[PDB]
Amino acid sequence: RQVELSTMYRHMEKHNYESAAEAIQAVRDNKLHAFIWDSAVLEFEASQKCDLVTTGELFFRSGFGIGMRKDSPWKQQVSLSILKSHENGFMEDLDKTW
């Protein structure tokens, strides 16, 4: 749902792939010009293999949180805990891990 890409979305059904890894392979074989995904993952990817480069800008501010259904008390506990990590370098430690 947007007006602008409507051309694009109209154009993008064709060559889309099942698993982004496959895309990495494909452009990695030059069978693709470019691929659309969320940044951090790809920073990791090209960060691994010299062959590829992040895009110029960064857009569609976004983030990751634990999937849980509807309403169950677990939400508060979980997120509270995740702050309970970000409070300290646990996350940065997670970089150090991966």
Partner 1 sequence: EWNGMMGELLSGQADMIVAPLTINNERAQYIEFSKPFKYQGLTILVKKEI
Partner 2 sequence: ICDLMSDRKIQGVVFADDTDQEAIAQILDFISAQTLTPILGIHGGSSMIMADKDESSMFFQFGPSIEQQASVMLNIMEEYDWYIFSIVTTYFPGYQDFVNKIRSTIENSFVGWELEEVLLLDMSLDDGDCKIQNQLKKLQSPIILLYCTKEEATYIFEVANSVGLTGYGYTWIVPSLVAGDTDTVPSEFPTGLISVSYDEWDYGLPARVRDGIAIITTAASDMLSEHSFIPEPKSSCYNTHEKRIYQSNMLNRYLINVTFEGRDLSFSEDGYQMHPKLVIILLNKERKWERVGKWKDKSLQMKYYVWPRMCPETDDHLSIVTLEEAPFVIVESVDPLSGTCMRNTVPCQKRIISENKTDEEPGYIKKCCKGFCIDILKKISKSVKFTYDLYLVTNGKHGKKINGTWNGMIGEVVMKRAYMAVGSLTINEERSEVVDFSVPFIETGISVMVSRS
Q: Which residues form the interface with partner 2 (CB under 8 A)? A: 3, 6-7, 9-10, 13, 61, 63, 80, 83-84, 87
Distance, C-alpha 16 to centroid of its chain: 16
State the binding partner of 39 from partner 2, partner 1, none, CB within 5 to 8 A by kind: partner 1
Q: Residue 34 or residue 80: which is nearer to partner 2 going by CB?
A: 80
Phi and psi for 48 in degrees, rounded to 5? Answer: -80, -45
Query: 90 in helix, strand or coil?
Result: helix
Residue 30 touching partner 1 (CB under 8 A): yes
State the binding partner of 97 from partner 1, partner 2, none, CB within 5 to 8 A by kind: none
Question: According to the annotation, is 38 in a ligand binding site?
Answer: yes
Question: Residue from 6, 25, 47, 54 that binds partner 1 (CB under 8 A)?
Answer: 54
Give the CA-trace dihedral at 94, 62, 87, 74, to 10 degrees: -100
What does the longest C-alpha to C-alpha distance in the chain come to? 48
